Protein backbone atom coordinates (compact mmCIF):
# COMPACT_ATOMS: atom_id res chain seq x y z
CA UNK A 1 0.00 0.00 0.00
CA UNK A 2 0.91 3.69 -0.06
CA UNK A 3 0.41 6.79 2.03
CA UNK A 4 1.49 10.41 1.92
CA UNK A 5 4.59 11.39 3.83
CA UNK A 6 3.97 13.44 6.98
CA UNK A 7 0.24 12.84 6.77
CA UNK A 8 -1.71 13.04 10.05
CA UNK A 9 -3.75 10.03 8.88
CA UNK A 10 -1.32 7.44 10.23
CA UNK A 11 -3.39 4.38 9.36
CA UNK A 12 -1.91 1.37 7.56
CA UNK A 13 -3.97 -1.01 5.43
CA UNK A 14 -2.98 -4.55 6.41
CA UNK A 15 -2.55 -6.94 3.50
CA UNK A 16 -3.61 -10.58 3.32
CA UNK A 17 -1.80 -13.76 2.29
CA UNK A 18 -4.25 -16.22 0.71
CA UNK A 19 -2.97 -19.63 -0.38
CA UNK A 20 -5.02 -21.22 -3.15
CA UNK A 21 -5.34 -24.78 -4.35
CA UNK A 22 -6.83 -27.11 -6.90
CA UNK A 23 -7.40 -30.85 -7.05
CA UNK A 24 -6.15 -33.44 -9.52
CA UNK A 25 -8.22 -36.63 -9.65
CA UNK A 26 -7.69 -40.10 -11.10
CA UNK A 27 -11.10 -40.77 -12.59
CA UNK A 28 -11.18 -42.75 -15.85
CA UNK A 29 -10.39 -46.36 -16.73
CA UNK A 30 -9.33 -46.95 -20.34
CA UNK A 31 -9.51 -50.57 -21.46
CA UNK A 32 -9.65 -52.86 -24.47
CA UNK A 33 -11.52 -56.10 -23.85
CA UNK A 34 -11.80 -59.18 -26.05
CA UNK A 35 -13.27 -62.65 -25.92
CA UNK A 36 -12.68 -65.64 -28.18
CA UNK A 37 -14.49 -68.94 -28.12
CA UNK A 38 -12.28 -72.02 -28.04
CA UNK A 39 -13.13 -72.72 -31.69
CA UNK A 40 -12.15 -69.17 -32.65
CA UNK A 41 -8.84 -69.45 -30.81
CA UNK A 42 -8.06 -72.92 -32.17
CA UNK A 43 -9.10 -72.31 -35.79
CA UNK A 44 -9.65 -68.62 -36.57
CA UNK A 45 -6.59 -67.24 -34.76
CA UNK A 46 -3.35 -68.08 -36.58
CA UNK A 47 -0.89 -65.55 -35.08
CA UNK A 48 -2.09 -64.40 -31.68
CA UNK A 49 0.33 -61.50 -31.26
CA UNK A 50 -0.01 -59.81 -34.65
CA UNK A 51 -3.74 -60.53 -34.84
CA UNK A 52 -4.85 -59.75 -31.28
CA UNK A 53 -2.28 -57.98 -29.11
CA UNK A 54 -1.06 -55.33 -31.54
CA UNK A 55 -4.59 -54.21 -32.53
CA UNK B 1 -8.21 -13.03 6.36
CA UNK B 2 -5.20 -15.23 5.72
CA UNK B 3 -6.03 -18.56 4.07
CA UNK B 4 -3.75 -21.58 4.37
CA UNK B 5 -3.85 -24.86 2.44
CA UNK B 6 -3.10 -27.80 4.73
CA UNK B 7 -3.51 -31.56 4.39
CA UNK B 8 -5.78 -33.76 6.46
CA UNK B 9 -3.25 -35.86 8.35
CA UNK B 10 -4.07 -39.39 9.48
CA UNK B 11 -2.23 -41.10 12.33
CA UNK B 12 -2.27 -44.34 14.30
CA UNK B 13 -1.62 -43.95 18.01
CA UNK B 14 -2.61 -47.35 19.35
CA UNK B 15 -6.40 -47.50 19.38
CA UNK B 16 -6.77 -50.99 17.93
CA UNK B 17 -10.47 -51.98 18.20
CA UNK B 18 -10.37 -54.07 21.37
CA UNK B 19 -11.32 -57.70 20.83
CA UNK B 20 -11.45 -61.04 22.65
CA UNK B 21 -8.62 -63.39 23.67
CA UNK B 22 -8.59 -66.97 22.38
CA UNK B 23 -8.18 -69.63 25.07
CA UNK B 24 -10.45 -72.61 24.28
CA UNK B 25 -8.69 -74.28 21.31
CA UNK B 26 -5.79 -75.37 23.51
CA UNK B 27 -7.98 -76.93 26.20
CA UNK B 28 -9.93 -79.38 24.03
CA UNK B 29 -8.82 -82.75 22.61
CA UNK B 30 -7.94 -82.02 18.98
CA UNK B 31 -7.39 -84.49 16.12
CA UNK B 32 -7.39 -87.93 17.74
CA UNK B 33 -8.75 -89.06 14.37
CA UNK B 34 -7.54 -87.82 10.98
CA UNK B 35 -8.94 -90.25 8.39
CA UNK B 36 -12.43 -89.00 7.60
CA UNK B 37 -11.52 -89.22 3.95
CA UNK B 38 -11.29 -92.99 3.89
CA UNK B 39 -14.33 -93.95 5.94
CA UNK B 40 -17.87 -93.68 4.65
CA UNK B 41 -20.06 -90.74 5.72
CA UNK B 42 -16.87 -88.98 6.90
CA UNK B 43 -17.33 -90.88 10.16
CA UNK B 44 -14.66 -92.82 12.02
CA UNK B 45 -16.06 -95.39 14.42
CA UNK B 46 -14.38 -95.59 17.83
CA UNK B 47 -14.47 -98.86 19.75
CA UNK B 48 -14.96 -98.98 23.52
CA UNK B 49 -13.80 -102.36 24.92
CA UNK B 50 -15.98 -104.78 26.84
CA UNK B 51 -16.49 -105.17 30.59
CA UNK B 52 -17.33 -108.46 32.31
CA UNK B 53 -19.43 -109.24 35.37
CA UNK B 54 -18.70 -112.12 37.72
Amino acid sequence: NRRDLRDPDRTVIASELVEHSFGVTLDKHVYAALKFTDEQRTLDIRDYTKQVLMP
Amino acid sequence: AHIFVKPELVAEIGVKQLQREIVLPGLVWTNPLTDFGGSKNDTITVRVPAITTA
Side-chain angles (χ1 to χ4, degrees):
Chain A
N1 306 287
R2 293 179 182 177
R3 53 181 301 282
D4 291 331
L5 209 72
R6 302 185 180 268
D7 213 30
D9 178 22
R10 323 204 56 75
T11 305
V12 285
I13 308 166
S15 314
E16 293 83 3
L17 291 159
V18 172
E19 281 175 4
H20 296 284
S21 81
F22 56 98
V24 189
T25 313
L26 184 63
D27 63 358
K28 197 69 41 184
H29 170 212
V30 173
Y31 64 90
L34 284 151
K35 63 174 181 176
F36 308 90
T37 65
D38 272 352
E39 301 94 22
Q40 275 179 315
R41 174 81 184 88
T42 307
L43 302 160
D44 297 327
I45 305 299
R46 44 201 212 275
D47 190 359
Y48 193 62
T49 294
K50 280 73 176 175
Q51 268 204 281
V52 176
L53 277 297
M54 293 180 183
Chain B
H2 307 310
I3 294 286
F4 300 92
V5 178
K6 314 168 94 173
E8 181 65 26
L9 302 182
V10 172
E12 293 179 353
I13 61 186
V15 186
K16 298 293 182 183
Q17 201 159 348
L18 60 83
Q19 185 178 2
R20 194 176 69 213
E21 186 178 4
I22 286 150
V23 65
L24 284 181
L27 315 165
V28 177
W29 198 11
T30 300
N31 278 317
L33 295 174
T34 303
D35 207 358
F36 305 94
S39 189
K40 57 165 152 182
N41 306 322
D42 306 331
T43 292
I44 306 294
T45 300
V46 176
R47 169 172 42 224
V48 193
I51 293 302
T52 309
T53 187

